[PDB]
Design a protein around this ligand. Sequence first.
Ligand SMILES: Nc1ncnc2c1ncn2[C@@H]1O[C@H](COP(=O)(O)OP(=O)(O)OP(=O)(O)O)[C@@H](O)[C@H]1O
Ligand SMILES: [Mg+2]
Ligand SMILES: [Mg+2]
Length: 325
Amino acid sequence: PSPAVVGRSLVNSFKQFVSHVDATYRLVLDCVAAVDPLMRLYTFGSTVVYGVHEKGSDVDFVVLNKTDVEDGKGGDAATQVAKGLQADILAKLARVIRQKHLSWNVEEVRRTRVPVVRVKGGGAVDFDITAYRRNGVRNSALLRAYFEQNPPCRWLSMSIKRWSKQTGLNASVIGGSITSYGFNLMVVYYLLQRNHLQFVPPSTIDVSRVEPLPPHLPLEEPADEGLELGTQVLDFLHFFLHEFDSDKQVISLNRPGITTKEELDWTKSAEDFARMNGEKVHYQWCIEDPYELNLNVGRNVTPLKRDFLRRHLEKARDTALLTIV
Ligand SMILES: Nc1ncnc2c1ncn2[C@@H]1O[C@H](COP(=O)(O)OP(=O)(O)OP(=O)(O)O)[C@@H](O)[C@H]1O
Ligand SMILES: [Mg+2]
Ligand SMILES: [Mg+2]
């Protein structure tokens, strides 16, 4: 199918979408304050990246102390005491949330690299809360700043996120390998490679200068019937099938141009040595996190999952991202 054909199907799939977070922010701050009236609440993830809250997305929150915010560019400790501190505050908050909302499922999730409290309330009211960490707010502000440069590119990212959840590529599905955040990094990397975006050094993002709850950023339908959308989608798929060399290169926002696996030591010798979360890291599909030290966002992409990804990338061309029936 042509770009126009693809663009039409896609604009056609979001028509229901085009036809809010304040109060949830406040409900959560009611809980945070009950634990500690000096603790701040910051928002991040898709709500922040896009400036729009999608149906079927959660909200990401983090609790910060005043001194965490003032150290606006500090890194996050990856130590066992940092994690102990985060668990301790989150336990307390979790207990307050259950008190104040008897009907919510409040899960203290301990599977993970970062301690998290996952709350499902029923009114499709879904959110993750973490503590004492800037990196989530910084990476979302970074991505936001990129999409603020070229607002219509959010439709490419939004199209790629939905497709990834529908094909089982997205980590939110059983067998999935790459988070939504991972996909965003890929979209922006691609856009940078094609000059649809101007490079932003990750170090220039300062948490002491971000909004706890950033303003909404209007999203308008593609007015060209989606020609540019459809063109961007096919080019994105071509790029990641035929241009990006997954054997030699890293999807990275830390520098403009090419980052190699060799300069990071993201090699077969490193996999033998390299563990994370208590399991193997893979370096088959490499996505450098712009803030965390030595973190491959594609660490779960085994050779099999890398196979699955390529196949779905190939297949997405003919079906316009699963939109042609
Ligand atoms: N693979 C990963 N490695 C490290 N950090 C991650 C990873 N995936 C997500 N995160 C963190 O979680 C935050 C939110 O990520 P998430 O995958 O939920 O993306 P999202 O854009 O909020 O999309 P969704 O609509 O799926 O919620 C990110 O800012 C990032 O800090
Ligand atoms: Mg999210
Ligand atoms: Mg998530």
